[PDB]
Design a protein around this ligand. Structure first.
Ligand code: MG
Ligand code: MG
Ligand code: MG
Ligand code: MG
Ligand code: MG
Ligand code: MG
Ligand code: MG
Ligand code: MG
Ligand code: MG
Ligand code: MG
Ligand code: MG
Ligand code: MG
Ligand code: MG
Ligand code: MG
Ligand code: MG
Ligand code: MG
Ligand code: MG
Ligand code: MG
Ligand code: MG
Ligand code: MG
Ligand code: MG
Ligand code: MG
Ligand code: MG
Ligand code: MG
Ligand code: MG
Ligand code: MG
Ligand code: MG
Ligand code: MG
Ligand code: MG
Ligand code: MG
Ligand code: MG
Ligand code: MG
Ligand code: MG
Ligand code: MG
Ligand code: MG
Ligand code: MG
Ligand code: MG
Ligand code: MG
Ligand code: MG
Ligand code: MG
Ligand code: MG
Ligand code: MG
Ligand code: MG
Ligand code: MG
Ligand code: MG
Ligand code: MG
Ligand code: MG
Ligand code: MG
Ligand code: MG
Ligand code: MG
Ligand code: MG
Ligand code: MG
Ligand code: MG
Ligand code: MG
Ligand code: MG
Ligand code: MG
Ligand code: MG
Ligand code: MG
Ligand code: MG
Ligand code: MG
Ligand code: MG
Ligand code: MG
Ligand code: MG
Ligand code: MG
Ligand code: MG
Ligand code: MG
Ligand code: MG
Ligand code: MG
Ligand code: MG
Ligand code: MG
Ligand code: MG
Lengths: 119, 135, 99, 87, 50, 60, 206
RNA sequence: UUGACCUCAAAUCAGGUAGGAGUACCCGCUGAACUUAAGCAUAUCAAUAAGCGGAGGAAAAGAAACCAACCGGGAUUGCCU
RNA sequence: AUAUUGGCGAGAGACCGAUAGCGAACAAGUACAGUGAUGGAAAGAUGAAAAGAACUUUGAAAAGAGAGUGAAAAAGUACGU
RNA sequence: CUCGUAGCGGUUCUGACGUGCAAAUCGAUCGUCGAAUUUGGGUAUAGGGGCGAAAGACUAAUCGAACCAUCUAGUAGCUG
RNA sequence: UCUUGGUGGUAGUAGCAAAUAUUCAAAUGAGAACUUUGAAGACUGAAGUGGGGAAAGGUUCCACGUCAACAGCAGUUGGACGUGGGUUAGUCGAUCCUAAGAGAUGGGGAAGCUCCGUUUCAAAGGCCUGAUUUUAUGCAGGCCACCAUCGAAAGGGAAUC
RNA sequence: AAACUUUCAACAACGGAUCUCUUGGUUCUCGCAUCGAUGAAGAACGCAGCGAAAUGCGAUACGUAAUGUGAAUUGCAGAAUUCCGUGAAUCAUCGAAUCUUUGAACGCACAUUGCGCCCCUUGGUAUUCCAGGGGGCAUGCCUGUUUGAGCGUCAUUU
């Protein structure tokens, strides 16, 4: 059937690392039996179990780094957002809305009034 | 003058198109200056240029360039227009002052070919515009 | 209407000098303080043959004035110059063949 | 002897495989690819070669990364994860 | 050429593993139109051009 | 006789065979097969017996 | 625009014992040596390729448009042309068939077809939905799968539900008096559509 | 001795940024010939195709060194004329 | 406001209907040709469902002749007409 | 230098063949055979250009101007 | 002398005649001029029709099964078809070196694609310290003047019979 | 009189026309703006219990995570307590990852699976040799840091 990921989030780093080793033994041992048998579909289950454990280990490791660079400048570049190269060249929301104080005075003095041609 | 390369200086067109030596290069020497500086400094945007010297062989220009990634330009609202991507390499697209001069972009009856580009105008005035109910 | 052989020689493709076997550039010793105010003594060690040249080359060996090492200049050999001959280059030198 | 017995002496190679396009167009003496123009930075394309632009343009291969941009655009370039657990 | 590059042997290795007929169970699949391997190559009939 | 990664040299074959199968290797001869796979002839030292170890892996 | 031209063919000329049409160059594909570019050649361009700048929409004088609309409304009077154009209206009491303005505020399709049958448009209604036939050519797979007849046109002055209540009914078309489509009044350029007028519609026609 | 200044360097220094793609449309540069003129050199094709450089969702242009000569209009763009 | 034979998402048609329509309805820029730039195809349709012909017999076999299946085998994978 | 093999060429039969074995071969007869020889690999020269002990020869069966794509459905008082 | 596809007559015709040459028996098989074995006759005749290799090919090598198509007759055979097996290096090559040459950098030209140049008009740099307790061996002396890189499976080259 | 040749018909051939179909093309319209040094487009090689392609993916390899749906996939085979469930599935969606060798491609090179150098670390008695694991080392330019050069140059010094 295979390992379930929600179980593997609950284990620690040393529990998951040893589980990967035992899974790699089971893949190796089944790869031997596949040379005698004509069809061994259990390869697929152990192989996706390895991919599941290796995934959960990496999500534990990347979340440790996110707590390491938590709320400072200069995250690592793969922990930065991957919008679009143009979308991160991109004058930010603060910088695009910058207004010189000569323009800030005019915008406060004479904003667009709300009005209607009725009366 | 621009020397037309055309190896051994040879035509192979009409004799109207037979000149090699006397071709004059529609963009100015100030434009070549900014284009060559903008290639060396592609992290910057060329803003303007100005003559500083000349001799028998060279004209000398000083080119003003602006860093669109420095935060003293990305803030300070008087200058962060240069940080928008429409202004990537203005000097190659001819959007500098010497580019707009040599493109002919000026108001008036003297610039009827070149007001919104001579090529755009030529496309407009050579288009057969047909309507649904033919006029 | 085709480019002639005398024009094609300037492109220098198959018309270059066959210069593999040549012994070097046959030049004089570079003009320095030794050859401008006194002299310097050389020694012929070989009268060799230069490929493509009808004149023999004399390999004349001098001492470097400023560093302890030997500098081998390549001369065109003068008729009468032999191996083992001391050769004098400079201003104060004596008139002998090969000086 | 210009036809058939001259065809016997064809056992050399002018081009081998290009590293950039894998095409047997890398001229081994000129050190250049005849189709993609490697090692030059720009990729060899010509507007008189409209069929030749068609053979190698965007869409002809896998598009490992552009085949996902439209979905990421449509969702507004989300960051994070979906909320709930199950049905 | 008995002293190959690895890049030649790697493409030579790929061509041998492609040098098989169609698997017979593929012709039994639902809505299947594949009758045969249309990309079959022989050393005798078509040179594969490096 | 093993099938190994194409990226594995004769040191990484010898190191892996030693700590997976608790043997000692006398020699490794390696060839890349005409299907593009790498085949390792791993000969053990005389203290071990490759017939017993073949049953201990599971094949024959 | 590039149909029949995505081919680099040139003529072999004379001397080759075959006609001088451009033949495809190359070798080893079957296409090689085949004639190209002609209207008579397989794969070639057609003669005089059709353009989008052919005249599609045609201009009619506004008064000649209105001339035809007035003569079409006049033809939806006395019943000879209404019988002639189909339109089972023998058992109608009188033409023009004017019904009350209360039809304009019927909002249910059940109540709408009750009213049209009660004023005698039942046989015209059953003439449609017994004439549903499959189209007789390639147009049935150009989203034109089914053909049927035209039914009674219902003309109103105010929409207060009659358009939506008569929307699903096969063959029954609706119209404001302010518009009065000629494609509805004389379908097929055949004068005499069966028209049911509401009373507000009929007064407004002055 | 020492401390600046100016100019110029170096670093696997701290942070960044440029290249390539695509290119229908857009801004430039460069630039033909077939063709027509019942020949053809001006001309025309054509300030076009091909070639090169640079952008964006539009671009460019744009708030007058304008049009006018009227009782004057009023940035730019595009449609009808 | 304007352009948009590219991309993404739609909705249409008095368009074409497998020698047509894109070169390509199909593992198509594929198979293949060329040193290379480049060139460049052919090729859709059993049946409502494989029900794709068990079994017998003749033959070394392919297969035939029966038998069957099927509405139809004047639909037998060489398959609508 | 010579006779003459291997080799490298190609005189004559105007031989065979001439829908060939072959889009240049086959056979006999021949030139020359220690150098201005013959030859593999590497390398350089690219189209109005190269290269040419020079024949407008050769430059992938293409040469008094290669090949590929585009302009281009180039134009035709001419033939179907 | 249209285009694409299909089909005829010619016509069971022309032809399948270079490289001296085949023959007997048995075996296998449905079937043997052609397969296998034995016997015999012959030939290439060491500048070979013999043993290896270079380029090129790419699995054609080898085994088993098989004969619809292919081997211009045949076919039980096969370089065909189906399924597999097979290529082991410190010493053989590549890798390294330079050759003719190719080619970056500094720099100059060119509107530009890019061109020139390979030591130039550049501030172009690593090498050992004698030998170790304040040494991640330098925070030191001291030395060196050249200046990328690619280029040979026939040249140069560490070592296996 | 046959045979032969010719004509027509039937049945059988050859061939794939005709008719009918159509997950394709073509043209028009409407809406949107989103590639890449955070490594794109393109390429190569590989990956499935049995796949040569197309499609998908990258040694976590016709996929992992997550979320939604709610019991399949299937040509076989296998599994199907999991099936009133954190739950089938070649499902949909997709925000988390992985993403070989490349490629603008970036230590040097590339007709090579060729060769360096640095840091951390492991083993072989090892700072130096050999190997394994991890992480690096391109160019231009900008800002800043630090270390510097120049009798360019200013003060200041027994
Ligand atoms: Mg001139
Ligand atoms: Mg209109
Ligand atoms: Mg020739
Ligand atoms: Mg010939
Ligand atoms: Mg090629
Ligand atoms: Mg491009
Ligand atoms: Mg390789
Ligand atoms: Mg090997
Ligand atoms: Mg080996
Ligand atoms: Mg067509
Ligand atoms: Mg019809
Ligand atoms: Mg840094
Ligand atoms: Mg434009
Ligand atoms: Mg423009
Ligand atoms: Mg005209
Ligand atoms: Mg004319
Ligand atoms: Mg004239
Ligand atoms: Mg003329
Ligand atoms: Mg003009
Ligand atoms: Mg153009
Ligand atoms: Mg964009
Ligand atoms: Mg807009
Ligand atoms: Mg703008
Ligand atoms: Mg003003
Ligand atoms: Mg105005
Ligand atoms: Mg489009
Ligand atoms: Mg048909
Ligand atoms: Mg077609
Ligand atoms: Mg080829
Ligand atoms: Mg059919
Ligand atoms: Mg059914
Ligand atoms: Mg039967
Ligand atoms: Mg029937
Ligand atoms: Mg039957
Ligand atoms: Mg029938
Ligand atoms: Mg039938
Ligand atoms: Mg002689
Ligand atoms: Mg003689
Ligand atoms: Mg001889
Ligand atoms: Mg002759
Ligand atoms: Mg003759
Ligand atoms: Mg023949
Ligand atoms: Mg002699
Ligand atoms: Mg020889
Ligand atoms: Mg010339
Ligand atoms: Mg002559
Ligand atoms: Mg040509
Ligand atoms: Mg023509
Ligand atoms: Mg024909
Ligand atoms: Mg015939
Ligand atoms: Mg005969
Ligand atoms: Mg005979
Ligand atoms: Mg003999
Ligand atoms: Mg003999
Ligand atoms: Mg056998
Ligand atoms: Mg035969
Ligand atoms: Mg046979
Ligand atoms: Mg064999
Ligand atoms: Mg086989
Ligand atoms: Mg050796
Ligand atoms: Mg080197
Ligand atoms: Mg080397
Ligand atoms: Mg030597
Ligand atoms: Mg048939
Ligand atoms: Mg027909
Ligand atoms: Mg349309
Ligand atoms: Mg998997
Ligand atoms: Mg799930
Ligand atoms: Mg699933
Ligand atoms: Mg090499
Ligand atoms: Mg090296």
């Amino acid at each position: 059937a295979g390992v379930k990921a929600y179980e593997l989030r609950t284990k620690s780093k040393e529990q998951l690392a040893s589980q990967l080793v035992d899974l790699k033994k089971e893949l190796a041992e089944l790869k031997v039996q596949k040379l005698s048998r004509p069809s061994l579909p259990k390869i697929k289950t152990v192989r996706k179990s390895i991919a599941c454990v290796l995934t959960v280990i990496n999500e534990q490791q990347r979340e440790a780094v996110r707590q390491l660079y938590k709320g400072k400048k200069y995250q690592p570049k793969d922990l930065r957002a991957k919008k679009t190269r143009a979308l991160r060249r991109a004058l930010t929301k603060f910088e695009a809305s910058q207004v010189t104080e000569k323009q800030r005075k005019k915008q406060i003095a004479f904003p667009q009034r709300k009005y209607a041609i009725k009366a | 003058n621009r020397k037309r390369p055309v190896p051994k200086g040879a035509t192979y067109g009409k004799p109207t198109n037979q000149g090699v030596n006397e071709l004059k290069y529609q963009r100015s020497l100030r434009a070549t200056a900014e284009e060559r500086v903008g290639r060396r400094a592609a992290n910057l945007r060329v803003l303007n240029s100005y003559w500083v010297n000349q001799d028998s062989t060279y004209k000398y220009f000083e080119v003003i360039l602006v860093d669109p990634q420095h935060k003293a330009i990305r803030r300070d609202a008087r200058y962060n227009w240069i940080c928008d991507p429409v202004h990537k390499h203005r000097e190659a697209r001819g959007l500098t002052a010497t580019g707009k001069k040599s493109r002919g972009i000026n108001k008036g009856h003297k610039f009827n070919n070149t007001k919104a580009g001579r090529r755009k105008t030529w496309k407009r005035q050579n288009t057969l515009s047909l309507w649904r109910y033919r006029k | 209407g085709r480019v002639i052989r005398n024009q094609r020689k300037g492109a220098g493709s198959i018309f270059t000098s066959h210069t593999r076997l040549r012994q070097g550039a046959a030049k004089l010793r570079t003009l320095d303080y030794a050859e401008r105010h006194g002299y310097i003594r050389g020694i012929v060690k070989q009268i060799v043959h230069d490929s493509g040249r009808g004149a023999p080359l004399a390999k004349v060996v001098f001492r470097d004035p400023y560093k302890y090492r030997l500098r081998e200049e390549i001369f065109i050999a003068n008729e009468g110059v032999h191996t083992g001959q001391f050769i004098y280059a400079g201003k104060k030198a004596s008139l002998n063949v090969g000086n | 002897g210009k036809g058939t017995p001259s065809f016997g002496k064809r056992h050399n190679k002018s081009h081998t495989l290009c590293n950039r396009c894998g095409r047997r167009s890398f001229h081994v003496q000129k050190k250049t690819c005849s189709s993609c123009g490697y090692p030059a930075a720009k990729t060899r394309s010509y507007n008189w070669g409209a069929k030749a632009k068609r053979r190698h343009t965007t869409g002809t291969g896998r598009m490992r990364y552009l085949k996902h941009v439209s979905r990421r655009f449509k969702n507004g370039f989300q960051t994070g994860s979906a909320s709930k657990a199950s049905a | 050429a008995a002293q190959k590059s690895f890049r030649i042997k790697q493409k030579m290795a790929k061509a041998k593993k492609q040098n098989r007929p169609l698997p017979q169970w593929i012709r039994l699949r639902t809505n299947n139109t594949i009758r045969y391997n249309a990309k079959r190559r022989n050393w005798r009939r078509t040179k594969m051009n490096i | 006789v093993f099938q190994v990664s194409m990226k594995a040299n004769k040191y990484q074959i010898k190191k892996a065979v030693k700590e997976l199968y608790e043997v000692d290797v006398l020699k490794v001869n390696t060839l890349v097969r005409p299907n593009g796979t790498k085949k390792a002839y791993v000969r053990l030292t005389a203290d071990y017996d490759a017939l017993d170890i073949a049953n201990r892996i599971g094949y024959i | 625009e590039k149909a029949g031209h995505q081919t680099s063919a040139e003529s072999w000329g004379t001397g080759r014992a075959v006609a001088r049409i451009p033949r495809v160059g190359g070798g080893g594909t079957g296409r090689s040596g085949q004639g190209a570019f002609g209207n008579m050649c397989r794969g070639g361009r057609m003669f005089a390729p059709t353009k989008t700048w052919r005249k599609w929409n045609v201009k009619v004088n506004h008064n000649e448009k209105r001339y035809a609309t007035a003569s079409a409304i006049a033809a939806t009077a006395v019943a000879s042309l209404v019988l002639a154009r189909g339109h089972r209206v023998e058992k109608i009491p009188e033409i023009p068939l004017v019904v009350s303005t209360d039809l304009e505020s019927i909002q249910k399709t059940k109540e709408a077809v009750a009213a049209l049958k009660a004023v005698g448009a039942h046989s015209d209604l059953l003439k449609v939905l017994k004439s549903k036939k499959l189209r007789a050519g390639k147009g049935k797979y150009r989203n034109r799968r089914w053909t049927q007849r035209r039914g009674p046109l219902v003309v109103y002055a105010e929409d207060n539900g009659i358009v939506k209540a008569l929307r699903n009914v096969p063959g029954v078309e609706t119209a404001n008096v302010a518009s009065l489509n000629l494609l509805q009044l004389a379908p097929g350029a055949h004068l005499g559509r069966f028209v049911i007028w509401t009373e507000a519609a009929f007064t407004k026609l002055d």
